[PDB]
Coordinates of C-alpha atoms and ligand atoms in Angstrom, one line a residue:
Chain A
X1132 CA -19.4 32.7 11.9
X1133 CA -19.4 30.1 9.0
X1134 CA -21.4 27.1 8.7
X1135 CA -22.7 27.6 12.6
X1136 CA -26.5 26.9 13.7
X1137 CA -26.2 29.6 16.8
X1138 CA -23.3 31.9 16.5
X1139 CA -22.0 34.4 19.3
X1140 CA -20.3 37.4 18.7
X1141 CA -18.2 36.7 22.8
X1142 CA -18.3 33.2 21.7
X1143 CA -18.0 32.4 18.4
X1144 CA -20.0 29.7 17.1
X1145 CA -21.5 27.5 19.7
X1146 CA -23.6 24.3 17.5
X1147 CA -22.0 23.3 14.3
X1148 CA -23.6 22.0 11.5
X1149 CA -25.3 18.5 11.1
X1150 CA -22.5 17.0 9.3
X1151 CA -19.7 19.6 10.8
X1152 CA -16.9 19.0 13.1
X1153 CA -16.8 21.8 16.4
X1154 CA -13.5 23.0 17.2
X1155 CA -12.3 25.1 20.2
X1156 CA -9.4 27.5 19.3
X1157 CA -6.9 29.2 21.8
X1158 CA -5.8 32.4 21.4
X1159 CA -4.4 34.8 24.4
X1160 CA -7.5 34.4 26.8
X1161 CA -9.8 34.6 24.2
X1162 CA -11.3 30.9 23.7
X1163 CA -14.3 30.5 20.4
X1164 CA -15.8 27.8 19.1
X1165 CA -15.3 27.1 14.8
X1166 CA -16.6 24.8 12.4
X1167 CA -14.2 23.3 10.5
X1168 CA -14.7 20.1 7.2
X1169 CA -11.7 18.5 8.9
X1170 CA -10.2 18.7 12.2
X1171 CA -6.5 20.1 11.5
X1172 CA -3.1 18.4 12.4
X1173 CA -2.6 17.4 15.4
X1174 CA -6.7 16.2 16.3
X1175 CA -8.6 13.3 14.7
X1176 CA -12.2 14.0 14.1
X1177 CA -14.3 12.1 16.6
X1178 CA -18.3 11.8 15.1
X1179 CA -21.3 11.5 17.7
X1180 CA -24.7 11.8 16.6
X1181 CA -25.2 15.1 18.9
X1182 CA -21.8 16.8 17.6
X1183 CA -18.8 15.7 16.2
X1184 CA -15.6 17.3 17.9
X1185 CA -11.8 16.8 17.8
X1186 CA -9.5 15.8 20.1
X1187 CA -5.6 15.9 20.2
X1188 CA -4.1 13.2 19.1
X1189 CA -2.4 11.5 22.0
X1190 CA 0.2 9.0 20.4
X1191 CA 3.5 11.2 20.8
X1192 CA 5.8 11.8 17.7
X1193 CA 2.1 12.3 15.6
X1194 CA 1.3 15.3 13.3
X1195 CA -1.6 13.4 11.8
X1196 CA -3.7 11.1 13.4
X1197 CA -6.7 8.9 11.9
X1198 CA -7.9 7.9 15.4
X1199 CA -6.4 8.7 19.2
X1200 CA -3.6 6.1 18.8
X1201 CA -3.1 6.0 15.2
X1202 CA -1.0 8.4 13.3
X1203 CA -0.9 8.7 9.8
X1204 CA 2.4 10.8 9.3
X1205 CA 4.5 11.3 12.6
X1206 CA 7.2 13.9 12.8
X1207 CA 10.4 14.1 10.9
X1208 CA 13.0 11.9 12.4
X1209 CA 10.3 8.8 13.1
X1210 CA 9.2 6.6 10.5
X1211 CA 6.2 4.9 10.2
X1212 CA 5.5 1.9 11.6
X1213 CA 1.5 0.4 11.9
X1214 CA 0.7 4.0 12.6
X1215 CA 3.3 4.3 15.5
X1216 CA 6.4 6.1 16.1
X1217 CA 10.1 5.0 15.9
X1218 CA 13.2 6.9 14.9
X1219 CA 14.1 3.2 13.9
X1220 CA 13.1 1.0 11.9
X1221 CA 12.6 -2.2 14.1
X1222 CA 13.6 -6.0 12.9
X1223 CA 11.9 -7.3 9.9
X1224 CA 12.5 -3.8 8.6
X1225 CA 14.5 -1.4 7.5
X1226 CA 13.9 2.9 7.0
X1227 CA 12.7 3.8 3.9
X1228 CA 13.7 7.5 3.1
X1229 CA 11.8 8.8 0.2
X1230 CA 8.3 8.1 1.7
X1231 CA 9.5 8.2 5.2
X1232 CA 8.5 5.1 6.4
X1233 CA 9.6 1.7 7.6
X1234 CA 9.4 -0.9 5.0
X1235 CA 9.9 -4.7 4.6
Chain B
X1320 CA -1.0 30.6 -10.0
X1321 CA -4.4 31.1 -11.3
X1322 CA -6.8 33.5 -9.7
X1323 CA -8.6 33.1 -7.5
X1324 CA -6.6 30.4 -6.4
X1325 CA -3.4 30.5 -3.6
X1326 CA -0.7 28.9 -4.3
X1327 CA 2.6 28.4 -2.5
X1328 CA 6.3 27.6 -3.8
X1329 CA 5.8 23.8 -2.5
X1330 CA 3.1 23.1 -5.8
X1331 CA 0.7 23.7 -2.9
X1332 CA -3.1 25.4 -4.0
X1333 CA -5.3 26.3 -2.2
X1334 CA -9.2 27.4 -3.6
X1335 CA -11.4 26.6 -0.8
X1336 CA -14.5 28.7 -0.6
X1337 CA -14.2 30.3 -3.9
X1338 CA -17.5 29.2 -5.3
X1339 CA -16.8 27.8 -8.3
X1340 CA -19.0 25.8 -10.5
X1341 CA -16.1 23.6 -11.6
X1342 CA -12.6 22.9 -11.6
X1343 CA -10.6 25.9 -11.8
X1344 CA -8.0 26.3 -14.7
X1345 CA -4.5 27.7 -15.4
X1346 CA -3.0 26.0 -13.5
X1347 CA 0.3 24.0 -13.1
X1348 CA 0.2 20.6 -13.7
X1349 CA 3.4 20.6 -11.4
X1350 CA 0.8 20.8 -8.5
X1351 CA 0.5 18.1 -6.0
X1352 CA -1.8 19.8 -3.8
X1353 CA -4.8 20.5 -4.4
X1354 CA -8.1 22.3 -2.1
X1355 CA -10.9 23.0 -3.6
X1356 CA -13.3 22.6 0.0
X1357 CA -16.2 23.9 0.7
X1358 CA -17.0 25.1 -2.6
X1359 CA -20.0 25.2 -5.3
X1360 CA -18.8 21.6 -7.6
X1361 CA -22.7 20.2 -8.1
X1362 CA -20.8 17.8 -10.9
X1363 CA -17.8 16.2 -12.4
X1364 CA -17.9 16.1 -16.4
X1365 CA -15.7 13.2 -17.8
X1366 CA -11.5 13.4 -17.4
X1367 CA -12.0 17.2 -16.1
X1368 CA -8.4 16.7 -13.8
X1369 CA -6.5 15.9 -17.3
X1370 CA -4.2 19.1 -16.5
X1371 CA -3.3 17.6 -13.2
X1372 CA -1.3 14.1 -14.1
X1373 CA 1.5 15.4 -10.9
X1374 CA -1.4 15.2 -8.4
X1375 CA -0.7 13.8 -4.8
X1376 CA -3.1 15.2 -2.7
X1377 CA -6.6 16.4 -3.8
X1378 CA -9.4 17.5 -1.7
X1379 CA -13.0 17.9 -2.1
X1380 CA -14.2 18.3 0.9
X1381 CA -18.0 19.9 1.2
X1382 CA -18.7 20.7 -2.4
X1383 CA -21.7 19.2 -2.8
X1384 CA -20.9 16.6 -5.5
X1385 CA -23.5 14.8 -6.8
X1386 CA -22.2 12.6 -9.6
X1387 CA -18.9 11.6 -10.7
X1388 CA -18.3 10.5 -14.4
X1389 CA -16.9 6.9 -14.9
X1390 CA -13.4 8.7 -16.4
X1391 CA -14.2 11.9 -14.3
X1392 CA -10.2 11.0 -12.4
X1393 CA -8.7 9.0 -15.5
X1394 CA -4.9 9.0 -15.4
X1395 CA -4.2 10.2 -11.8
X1396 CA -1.4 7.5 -10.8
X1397 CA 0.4 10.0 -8.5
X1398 CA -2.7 10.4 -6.5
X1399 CA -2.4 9.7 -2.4
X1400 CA -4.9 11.3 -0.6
X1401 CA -8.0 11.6 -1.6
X1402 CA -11.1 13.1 0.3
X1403 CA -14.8 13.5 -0.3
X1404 CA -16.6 13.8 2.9
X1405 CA -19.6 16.1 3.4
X1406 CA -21.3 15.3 0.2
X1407 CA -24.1 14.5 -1.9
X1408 CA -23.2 11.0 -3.1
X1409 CA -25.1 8.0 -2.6
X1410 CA -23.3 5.1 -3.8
X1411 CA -19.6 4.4 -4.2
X1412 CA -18.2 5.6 -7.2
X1413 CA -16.8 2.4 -8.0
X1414 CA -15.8 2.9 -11.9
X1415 CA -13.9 6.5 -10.9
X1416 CA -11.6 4.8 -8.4
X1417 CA -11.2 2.4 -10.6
X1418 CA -7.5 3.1 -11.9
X1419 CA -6.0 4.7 -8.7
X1420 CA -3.2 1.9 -8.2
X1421 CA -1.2 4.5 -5.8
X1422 CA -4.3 5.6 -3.8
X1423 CA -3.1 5.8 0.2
X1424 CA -5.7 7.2 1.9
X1425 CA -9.3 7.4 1.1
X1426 CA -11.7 9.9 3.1
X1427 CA -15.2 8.8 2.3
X1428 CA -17.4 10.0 5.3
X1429 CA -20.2 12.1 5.7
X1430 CA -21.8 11.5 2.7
X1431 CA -25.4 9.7 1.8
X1432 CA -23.9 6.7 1.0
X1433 CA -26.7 4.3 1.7
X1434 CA -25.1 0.6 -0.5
X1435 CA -21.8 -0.8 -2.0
X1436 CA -21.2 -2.0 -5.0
X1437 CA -19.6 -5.8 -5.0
X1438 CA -17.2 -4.6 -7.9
X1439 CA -16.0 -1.0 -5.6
X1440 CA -12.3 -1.0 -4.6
X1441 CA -10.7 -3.3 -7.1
X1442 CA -7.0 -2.8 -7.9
X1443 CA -6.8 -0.5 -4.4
X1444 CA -3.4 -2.0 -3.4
X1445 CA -2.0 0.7 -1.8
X1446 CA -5.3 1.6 0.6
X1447 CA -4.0 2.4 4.0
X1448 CA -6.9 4.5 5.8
X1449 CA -10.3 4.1 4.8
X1450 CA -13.0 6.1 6.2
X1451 CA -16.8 5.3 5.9
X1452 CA -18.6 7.6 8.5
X1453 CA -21.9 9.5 8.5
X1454 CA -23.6 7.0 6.1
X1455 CA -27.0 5.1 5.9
X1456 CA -25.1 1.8 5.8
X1457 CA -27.3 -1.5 7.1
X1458 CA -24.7 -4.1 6.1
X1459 CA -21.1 -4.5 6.4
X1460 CA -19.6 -4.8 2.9
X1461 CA -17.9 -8.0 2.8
X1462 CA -17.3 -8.5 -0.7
X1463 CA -15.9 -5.3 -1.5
X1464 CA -13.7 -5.3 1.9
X1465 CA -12.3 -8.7 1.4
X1466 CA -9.9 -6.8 -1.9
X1467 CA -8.2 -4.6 0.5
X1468 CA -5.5 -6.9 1.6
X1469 CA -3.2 -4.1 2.7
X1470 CA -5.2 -1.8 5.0
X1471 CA -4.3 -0.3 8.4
X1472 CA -7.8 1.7 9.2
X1473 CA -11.3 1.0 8.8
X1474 CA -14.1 3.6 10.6
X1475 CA -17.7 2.5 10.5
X1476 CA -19.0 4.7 13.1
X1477 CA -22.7 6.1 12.9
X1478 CA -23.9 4.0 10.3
X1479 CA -27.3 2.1 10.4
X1480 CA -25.2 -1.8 10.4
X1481 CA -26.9 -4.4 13.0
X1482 CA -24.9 -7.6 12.7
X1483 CA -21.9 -8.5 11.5
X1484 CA -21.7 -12.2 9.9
X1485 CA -18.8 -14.6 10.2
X1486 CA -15.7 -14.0 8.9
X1487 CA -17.3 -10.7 7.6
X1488 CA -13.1 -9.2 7.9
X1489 CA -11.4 -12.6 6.9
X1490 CA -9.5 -11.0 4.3
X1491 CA -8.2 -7.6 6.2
X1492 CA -5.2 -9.5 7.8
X1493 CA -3.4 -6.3 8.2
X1494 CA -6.0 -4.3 10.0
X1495 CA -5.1 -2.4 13.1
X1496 CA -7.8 -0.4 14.1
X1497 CA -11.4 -0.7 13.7
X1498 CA -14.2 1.6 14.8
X1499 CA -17.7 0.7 14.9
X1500 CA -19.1 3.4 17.6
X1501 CA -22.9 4.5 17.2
X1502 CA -24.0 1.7 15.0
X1503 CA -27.1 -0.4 15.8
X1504 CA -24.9 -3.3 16.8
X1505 CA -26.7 -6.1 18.4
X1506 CA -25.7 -9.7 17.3
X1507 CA -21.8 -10.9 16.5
X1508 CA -21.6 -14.6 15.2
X1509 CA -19.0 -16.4 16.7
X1510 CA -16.3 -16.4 14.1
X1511 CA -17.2 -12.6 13.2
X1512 CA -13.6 -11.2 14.0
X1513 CA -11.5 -14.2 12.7
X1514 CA -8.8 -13.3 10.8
X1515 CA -8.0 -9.8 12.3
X1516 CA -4.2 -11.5 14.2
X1517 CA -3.1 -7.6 14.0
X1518 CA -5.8 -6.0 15.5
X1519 CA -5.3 -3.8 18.0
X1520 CA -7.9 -1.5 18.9
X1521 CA -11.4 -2.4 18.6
X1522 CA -14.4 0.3 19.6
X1523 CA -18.0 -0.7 20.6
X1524 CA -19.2 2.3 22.0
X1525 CA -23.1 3.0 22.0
X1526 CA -24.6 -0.3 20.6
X1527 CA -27.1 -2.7 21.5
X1528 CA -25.1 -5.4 22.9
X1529 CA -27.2 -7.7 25.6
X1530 CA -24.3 -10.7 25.3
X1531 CA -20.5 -10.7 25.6
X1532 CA -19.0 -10.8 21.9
X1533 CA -17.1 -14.4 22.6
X1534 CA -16.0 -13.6 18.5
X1535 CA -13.2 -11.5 20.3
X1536 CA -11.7 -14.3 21.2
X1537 CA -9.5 -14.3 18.2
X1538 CA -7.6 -11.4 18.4
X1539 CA -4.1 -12.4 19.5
X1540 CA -3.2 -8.5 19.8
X1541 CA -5.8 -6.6 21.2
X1542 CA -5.2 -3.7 23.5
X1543 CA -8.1 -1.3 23.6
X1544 CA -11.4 -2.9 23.9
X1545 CA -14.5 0.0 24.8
X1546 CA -18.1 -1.3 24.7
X1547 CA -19.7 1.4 27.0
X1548 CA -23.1 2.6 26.6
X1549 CA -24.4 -0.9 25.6
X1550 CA -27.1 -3.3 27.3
X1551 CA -24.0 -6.0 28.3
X1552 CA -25.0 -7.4 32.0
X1553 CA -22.6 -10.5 32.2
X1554 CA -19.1 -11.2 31.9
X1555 CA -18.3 -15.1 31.8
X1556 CA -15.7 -16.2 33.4
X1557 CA -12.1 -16.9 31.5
X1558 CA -13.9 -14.0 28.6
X1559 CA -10.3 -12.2 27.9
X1560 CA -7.8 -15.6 27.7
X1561 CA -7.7 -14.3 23.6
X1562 CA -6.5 -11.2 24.8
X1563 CA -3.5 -11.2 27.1
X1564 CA -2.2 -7.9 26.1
X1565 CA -5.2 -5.3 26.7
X1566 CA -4.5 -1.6 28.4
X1567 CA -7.9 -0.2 29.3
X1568 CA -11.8 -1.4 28.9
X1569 CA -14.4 0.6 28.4
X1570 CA -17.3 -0.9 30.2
X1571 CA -18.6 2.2 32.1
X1572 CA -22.5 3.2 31.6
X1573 CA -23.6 -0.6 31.4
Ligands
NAG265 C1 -24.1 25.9 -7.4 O1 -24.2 25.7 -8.8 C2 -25.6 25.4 -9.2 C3 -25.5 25.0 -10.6 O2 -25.0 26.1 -11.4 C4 -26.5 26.6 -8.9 O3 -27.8 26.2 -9.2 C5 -26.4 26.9 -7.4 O4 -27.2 28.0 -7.1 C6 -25.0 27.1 -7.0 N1 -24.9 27.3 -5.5 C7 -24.2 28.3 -5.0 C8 -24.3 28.3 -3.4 O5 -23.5 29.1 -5.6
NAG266 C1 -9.4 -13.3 0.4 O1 -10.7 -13.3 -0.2 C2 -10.8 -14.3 -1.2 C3 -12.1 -14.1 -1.9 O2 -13.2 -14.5 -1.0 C4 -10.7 -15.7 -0.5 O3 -10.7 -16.7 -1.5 C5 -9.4 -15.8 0.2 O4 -9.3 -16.9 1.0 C6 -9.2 -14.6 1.2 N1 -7.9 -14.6 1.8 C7 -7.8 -14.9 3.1 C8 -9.0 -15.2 3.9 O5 -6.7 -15.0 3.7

C-alpha cells in the first residue's frame, strides 16, 4: 500500500497516484492492484488523464516496449530493427553483436 | 556494495526508496546500473556522479528533483538510459545534457515541464526514444526537435499543445512512432507531417478535431492511424490514397 489514494487490504491498492502508473499483478488466484514509477518489462506505460495503466506489449519477440508495437530491446536471438523483431538482419544491413542490433 | 544500497554481480545497484538526501557513496565506479527511484534527491550539487564515469543506465525516477547544476552529469559518455519522470522540474535542463554524446534513451515525462529551451538537445546523436508526457506544454518544440536527426520515438501525450504548424517535424526523417493522445489538438496546417516518409504509427486519440487532417497525406508508410474521441464528422472521398499500407483506424466514439 505505497503511493495509493484508496488502498484495500482484499484488494490492494485500487486509485494510484496523480502522476502514478496502476498495475494489476497475478499471483495464484489472488489478483491486487500496485503502483509502480514505471511499468515493468514486458508492458509500456499508457497515460490517460483519469489513470495511467500498462498493458502488455503485443509485438512478439519484445522484452521492452516504448509503445504497443514498438520494442526497445527484443529477446536474445533477434536484433533490432525500427523497434521490430528479426533473428536477421534484413538487406541494407547486417547483425551487429555487441549492442545487439541490426546496423547499416 | 555500499549500504544501504543492493547490488548484484552484473555492476547492477539498486537504492530505490532509501531516502537519501543525495547521491549515495562507496561505491564502484565499475557500476553501470544505477536506481536511485523514489527517493528524497530535492537537488543535484555540481559534478556529484564524478565516481561513476562506467555508468550506462541511471535512474531517477520520482525523487523530487528540483534543480540540476549546469556540470551536475559532466563526463558521463557511457551513459544510455536516462530517466527523470515524476519530478519537480520545470524547464529542460538543457546545459546538463549537454555532453551526453552516447545518450539512447531519454525518459522525460511526468514532470512540470511547462517551455523548451531553443538551445536543449544539441549534440544528442545517439537519441532513440524520447519521452515528453505529463507536461504543461502549449507548443510543439520545433527548434529544439529539428537536432534530433536520428530518433525512432517521440510521445507527446497529455500535454496542453493546440496546433501544430507546418513542417513542425521536417527534420525527424527517421521517426517511427509518434503519439499525441489527450492534447488539445484542434488545427493541422497542411504540410504539418511533411517529412515523416518512415512513419508508421500515428495516434490522435481524444482531441478536438472538427476536419479530416489532409496533412497525412504525406506519410508513404503509415499503418496505424487512431483519431477516436474527436469531433471529426466527414471523411472526403480519396482521404487515404497517401496511405496504402494502413492495418486498423481508430474512428470509434466520433
Ligand atoms: C527531503 O529532504 C529535504 C531537504 O533536506 C527535507 O526538507 C525533506 O523533509 C525531505 N523529505 C523526506 C520525505 O524525507
Ligand atoms: C534540418 O534542420 C535544419 C535547421 O532548420 C534545416 O536547415 C535542414 O534543412 C533540416 N533538414 C531536413 C529538413 O532534412
Amino acid at each position: 500500500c505505497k503511493g495509493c489514494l484508496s488502498c484495500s487490504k482484499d484488494n490492494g491498492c485500487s486509485r494510484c497516484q496523480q502522476k502514478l502508473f496502476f498495475f494489476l499483478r497475478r499471483e495464484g488466484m489472488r489478483q491486487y492492484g500496485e503502483c509502480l514509477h514505471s511499468c515493468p518489462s514486458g508492458y509500456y506505460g499508457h497515460r490517460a488523464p483519469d489513470m495511467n495503466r500498462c498493458a502488455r506489449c503485443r509485438i512478439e519477440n519484445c522484452d521492452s516496449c516504448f509503445s504497443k508495437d514498438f520494442c526497445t530491446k527484443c529477446k536474445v536471438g533477434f536484433y533490432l530493427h525500427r523497434g521490430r523483431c528479426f533473428d536477421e538482419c534484413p538487406d541494407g544491413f547486417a547483425p551487429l553483436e555487441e549492442t545487439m542490433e541490426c546496423v547499416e | 556494495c555500499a549500504a544501504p544500497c543492493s547490488c548484484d554481480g552484473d555492476r547492477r545497484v539498486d537504492c530505490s526508496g532509501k531516502g537519501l538526501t543525495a547521491v549515495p557513496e562507496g561505491l564502484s565506479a565499475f557500476t553501470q546500473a544505477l536506481d536511485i527511484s523514489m527517493n528524497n534527491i530535492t537537488q543535484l550539487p555540481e559534478d556529484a556522479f564524478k565516481n561513476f564515469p562506467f555508468l550506462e543506465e541511471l535512474q531517477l525516477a520520482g525523487n523530487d528533483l528540483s534543480f540540476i547544476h549546469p556540470k551536475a552529469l559532466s563526463g558521463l559518455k557511457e551513459l544510455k538510459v536516462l530517466t527523470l519522470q515524476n519530478n519537480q522540474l520545470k524547464t529542460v535542463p538543457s546545459e546538463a545534457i549537454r555532453g551526453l554524446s552516447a545518450l539512447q534513451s531519454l525518459r522525460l515525462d511526468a514532470n512540470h515541464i511547462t517551455s523548451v529551451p531553443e538551445d536543449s538537445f544539441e549534440g544528442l546523436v545517439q537519441l532513440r526514444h524520447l519521452w515528453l508526457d505529463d507536461n504543461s506544454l502549449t507548443e510543439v518544440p520545433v527548434h529544439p526537435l529539428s537536432n534530433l536527426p536520428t530518433l525512432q520515438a517521440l510521445t507527446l501525450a497529455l500535454n496542453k499543445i493546440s496546433s501544430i504548424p507546418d513542417f513542425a517535424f521536417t527534420n525527424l526523417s527517421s521517426l517511427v512512432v509518434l503519439h499525441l493522445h489527450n492534447n488539445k489538438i484542434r488545427s493541422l496546417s497542411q504540410h504539418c507531417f511533411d517529412g515523416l516518409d518512415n512513419l508508421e504509427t500515428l495516434d490522435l486519440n481524444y482531441n478536438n478535431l472538427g476536419e479530416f487532417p489532409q496533412a497525412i497525406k504525406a506519410l508513404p508508410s503509415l499503418k496505424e492511424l487512431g483519431f477516436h474521441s474527436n469531433s471529426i464528422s466527414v471523411i472526403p472521398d480519396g482521404a487515404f490514397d497517401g496511405n496504402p499500407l494502413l492495418r486498423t483506424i481508430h474512428l470509434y466514439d466520433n
